[PDB]
Scaffold this active site. Structure first.
Site, PDB file in Angstrom:
ATOM      1  N   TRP A  10     -10.096  -8.875   2.509  1.00 51.25           N
ATOM      2  CA  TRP A  10     -10.519  -9.114   1.025  1.00 51.25           C
ATOM      3  C   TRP A  10     -10.282 -11.245   1.273  1.00 51.25           C
ATOM      4  CZ3 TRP A  10      -8.084  -5.328   1.600  1.00 51.25           C
ATOM      5  CH2 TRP A  10      -8.391  -3.728   1.354  1.00 51.25           C
TER       6      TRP A  10
ATOM      7  N   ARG B 141       1.029  -1.610   0.175  1.00 49.80           N
ATOM      8  CA  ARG B 141      -0.064  -0.586  -0.235  1.00 49.80           C
ATOM      9  C   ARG B 141       1.112   1.308   0.242  1.00 49.80           C
ATOM     10  NH1 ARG B 141      -3.208   2.529   5.396  1.00 49.80           N
ATOM     11  NH2 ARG B 141      -4.444   4.738   3.942  1.00 49.80           N
TER      12      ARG B 141
ATOM     13  N   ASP C  33      -1.811 -14.453  -3.847  1.00 56.79           N
ATOM     14  CA  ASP C  33      -2.469 -15.242  -4.579  1.00 56.79           C
ATOM     15  C   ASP C  33      -3.779 -14.573  -5.636  1.00 56.79           C
ATOM     16  OD1 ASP C  33      -4.678 -15.028  -3.243  1.00 56.79           O
ATOM     17  OD2 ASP C  33      -4.403 -17.099  -2.537  1.00 56.79           O
TER      18      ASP C  33
ATOM     19  N   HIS D  82      -5.190  -6.355  -3.194  1.00 55.36           N
ATOM     20  CA  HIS D  82      -6.332  -6.428  -2.527  1.00 55.36           C
ATOM     21  C   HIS D  82      -6.430  -8.531  -2.304  1.00 55.36           C
ATOM     22  CE1 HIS D  82      -8.603  -2.640  -2.521  1.00 55.36           C
ATOM     23  NE2 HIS D  82      -7.189  -2.174  -1.885  1.00 55.36           N
TER      24      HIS D  82
ATOM     25  N   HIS E  82       0.585   3.343  -3.222  1.00 54.63           N
ATOM     26  CA  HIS E  82       0.148   5.224  -2.558  1.00 54.63           C
ATOM     27  C   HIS E  82       1.006   6.111  -2.268  1.00 54.63           C
ATOM     28  CE1 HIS E  82      -3.817   4.911  -0.358  1.00 54.63           C
ATOM     29  NE2 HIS E  82      -3.768   3.721  -0.981  1.00 54.63           N
TER      30      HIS E  82
ATOM     31  N   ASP F  67     -14.368  -3.182  -5.376  1.00 54.99           N
ATOM     32  CA  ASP F  67     -14.056  -4.496  -5.616  1.00 54.99           C
ATOM     33  C   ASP F  67     -15.456  -4.540  -6.086  1.00 54.99           C
ATOM     34  OD1 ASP F  67     -11.329  -4.395  -4.392  1.00 54.99           O
ATOM     35  OD2 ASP F  67     -13.019  -4.299  -2.883  1.00 54.99           O
TER      36      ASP F  67
HETATM   37  C1  HEM Z   1      -8.800  -0.056  -7.379  1.00 57.13           C
HETATM   38  C2  HEM Z   1      -8.925   0.991  -6.283  1.00 57.13           C
HETATM   39  C3  HEM Z   1      -9.051   0.367  -4.882  1.00 57.13           C
HETATM   40  C4  HEM Z   1      -9.272   1.133  -3.602  1.00 57.13           C
HETATM   41  C5  HEM Z   1     -11.209   1.876  -3.602  1.00 57.13           C
HETATM   42  C6  HEM Z   1      -8.455   1.107  -2.749  1.00 57.13           C
HETATM   43  C7  HEM Z   1      -8.937   1.160  -1.531  1.00 57.13           C
HETATM   44  C8  HEM Z   1      -8.250   0.906  -0.542  1.00 57.13           C
HETATM   45  C9  HEM Z   1      -8.868   1.003   1.210  1.00 57.13           C
HETATM   46  C10 HEM Z   1     -10.317   1.710   1.489  1.00 57.13           C
HETATM   47  C11 HEM Z   1      -8.034   0.144   1.902  1.00 57.13           C
HETATM   48  C12 HEM Z   1      -7.647   0.086   3.298  1.00 57.13           C
HETATM   49  C13 HEM Z   1      -7.065   0.137   4.008  1.00 57.13           C
HETATM   50  C14 HEM Z   1      -7.316   0.922   5.604  1.00 57.13           C
HETATM   51  O1  HEM Z   1      -8.037   0.479   5.853  1.00 57.13           O
HETATM   52  O2  HEM Z   1      -5.560   0.292   6.024  1.00 57.13           O
HETATM   53  C15 HEM Z   1      -6.920  -0.466   0.896  1.00 57.13           C
HETATM   54  C16 HEM Z   1      -6.441  -1.327   1.859  1.00 57.13           C
HETATM   55  C17 HEM Z   1      -5.372  -1.958   0.878  1.00 57.13           C
HETATM   56  N1  HEM Z   1      -4.912  -1.598  -0.828  1.00 57.13           N
HETATM   57 FE1  HEM Z   1      -6.002  -0.813  -1.864  1.00 57.13          FE
HETATM   58  N2  HEM Z   1      -7.215   0.170  -2.493  1.00 57.13           N
HETATM   59  C18 HEM Z   1      -7.219   0.020  -4.541  1.00 57.13           C
HETATM   60  C19 HEM Z   1      -6.085  -0.362  -5.170  1.00 57.13           C
HETATM   61  C20 HEM Z   1      -5.457  -0.851  -5.037  1.00 57.13           C
HETATM   62  C21 HEM Z   1      -3.731  -1.127  -5.416  1.00 57.13           C
HETATM   63  C22 HEM Z   1      -3.498  -0.606  -6.388  1.00 57.13           C
HETATM   64  C23 HEM Z   1      -2.710  -1.528  -4.198  1.00 57.13           C
HETATM   65  C24 HEM Z   1      -1.935  -2.665  -4.816  1.00 57.13           C
HETATM   66  C25 HEM Z   1      -1.342  -3.251  -6.343  1.00 57.13           C
HETATM   67  C26 HEM Z   1      -3.563  -1.589  -3.685  1.00 57.13           C
HETATM   68  C27 HEM Z   1      -3.116  -2.338  -2.409  1.00 57.13           C
HETATM   69  C28 HEM Z   1      -4.414  -2.754  -0.775  1.00 57.13           C
HETATM   70  C29 HEM Z   1      -3.218  -3.238  -0.060  1.00 57.13           C
HETATM   71  C30 HEM Z   1      -2.299  -4.099  -0.279  1.00 57.13           C
HETATM   72  C31 HEM Z   1      -3.722  -3.255   0.932  1.00 57.13           C
HETATM   73  C32 HEM Z   1      -3.771  -3.375   2.923  1.00 57.13           C
HETATM   74  C33 HEM Z   1      -3.098  -2.830   3.783  1.00 57.13           C
HETATM   75  C34 HEM Z   1      -2.891  -3.519   4.963  1.00 57.13           C
HETATM   76  O3  HEM Z   1      -3.017  -4.392   5.251  1.00 57.13           O
HETATM   77  O4  HEM Z   1      -2.897  -2.644   5.577  1.00 57.13           O
HETATM   78  N3  HEM Z   1      -4.917  -1.445  -3.212  1.00 57.13           N
HETATM   79  N4  HEM Z   1      -7.748  -0.333  -0.052  1.00 57.13           N
HETATM   80 NA    NA Z   2      -4.497 -14.148  -0.431  1.00 60.77          NA
END
Ligand code: HEM
Ligand code: NA
Length: 250
Positions: free
Chosen positions: A179, A38, A187, A163, A42, A208
């Site tokens: 998720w 993340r 995976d 995700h 970001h 999603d």
């Molecule tokens: C497609 C549009 C996307 C939206 C709307 C979105 C939104 C979010 C939100 C709301 C969270 C929760 C953050 C939290 O509360 O800790 C999150 C977590 C996360 N996002 Fe996304 N995301 C998007 C795309 C992506 C992309 C492109 C990646 C990387 C390739 C990504 C990787 C992650 C990961 C790995 C987490 C988990 C972080 C953790 O476990 O601390 N996301 N995302």
């Molecule tokens: Na997984």
């Protein structure tokens, strides 16, 4: 041929490799790969091709960008990595945080994403508001990934597979839950869970779910749910592009 990568010194390359090894150990040892993915995403996903502002230029170290609502909790990631960064003063923060993202995917079992050094640390963060809104749908995803970043619909669906790692936190985004049942394993489970619908113990964001109803995104969801090798290939290509937005463009 869209890129012309810069020449960096042998010492810079050696620092990349030694930092990579330290990051691999720390990210695995601290079980923080999702947060580090993340962080890298970001950092990179703020690029807007129309102004060439934002992107993977180290600005996540800037407290003003850490204060963006979308970046809640990334201050933890910056601080966790700073002891390693202090050992590698030659590296840009820009390169370092993208390297952390590549390592995060590797250590969780994902594809080996190429890494090309040389990003500069730019002084100004992007304006807040470039990143995708989890409550919005496919038109918005195309504005953010397509019109701003220059990425394809395939890239959108593949990158949404990020995700497959980690979870949402009520104090960070306000959403809560993972998720997947195996959030430290890279995976294709994210797509399998999307297809099987909502279920107790797992989360799906509106963004999603937009992948399921869109006629161009849905075939890609079906493909990645059935074929992890295809997902890894397309994810690798998309992450590479993401990590290099605005960088080394020919
Ligand atoms: C497609 C549009 C996307 C939206 C709307 C979105 C939104 C979010 C939100 C709301 C969270 C929760 C953050 C939290 O509360 O800790 C999150 C977590 C996360 N996002 Fe996304 N995301 C998007 C795309 C992506 C992309 C492109 C990646 C990387 C390739 C990504 C990787 C992650 C990961 C790995 C987490 C988990 C972080 C953790 O476990 O601390 N996301 N995302
Ligand atoms: Na997984």
């Amino acid at each position: 041929m869209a890129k012309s990568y810069p020449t960096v010194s042998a010492e810079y390359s050696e620092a990349v490799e030694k930092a990579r090894q330290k990051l691999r150990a720390l990210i695995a040892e601290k079980s923080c790969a999702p947060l580090m993915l993340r962080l890298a995403w970001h950092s990179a996903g703020t690029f807007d091709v129309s102004s060439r502002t934002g992107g993977p230029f180290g600005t996540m170290k800037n407290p003003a960008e850490l204060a963006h609502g979308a970046n809640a909790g990334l201050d933890i990631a910056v601080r966790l990595l700073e002891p390693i960064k202090e050992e590698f003063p030659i590296l840009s923060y820009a390169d370092f945080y993208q390297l952390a993202g590549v390592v995060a995917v590797e250590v969780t079992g994902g594809p080996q994403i190429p890494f090309h050094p040389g990003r500069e640390d730019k002084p100004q963060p992007p304006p807040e508001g470039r990143l995708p809104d989890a409550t919005k749908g496919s038109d918005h995803l195309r504005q953010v990934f397509g019109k701003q970043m220059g990425l394809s619909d395939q890239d959108i669906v593949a990158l949404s597979g990020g995700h497959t790692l980690g979870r949402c936190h009520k104090e960070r985004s306000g959403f809560e839950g993972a998720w997947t049942s195996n959030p430290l394993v890279f995976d294709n489970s994210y797509f399998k869970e999307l297809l099987s619908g909502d279920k107790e113990g797992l989360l799906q964001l509106p963004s999603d779910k937009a992948l399921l109803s869109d006629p161009a995104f849905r075939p890609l969801v079906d493909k990645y749910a059935a074929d992890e090798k295809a997902f890894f290939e397309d994810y690798k290509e998309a992450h590479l592009k993401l990590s290099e937005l605005g960088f080394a463009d020919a």
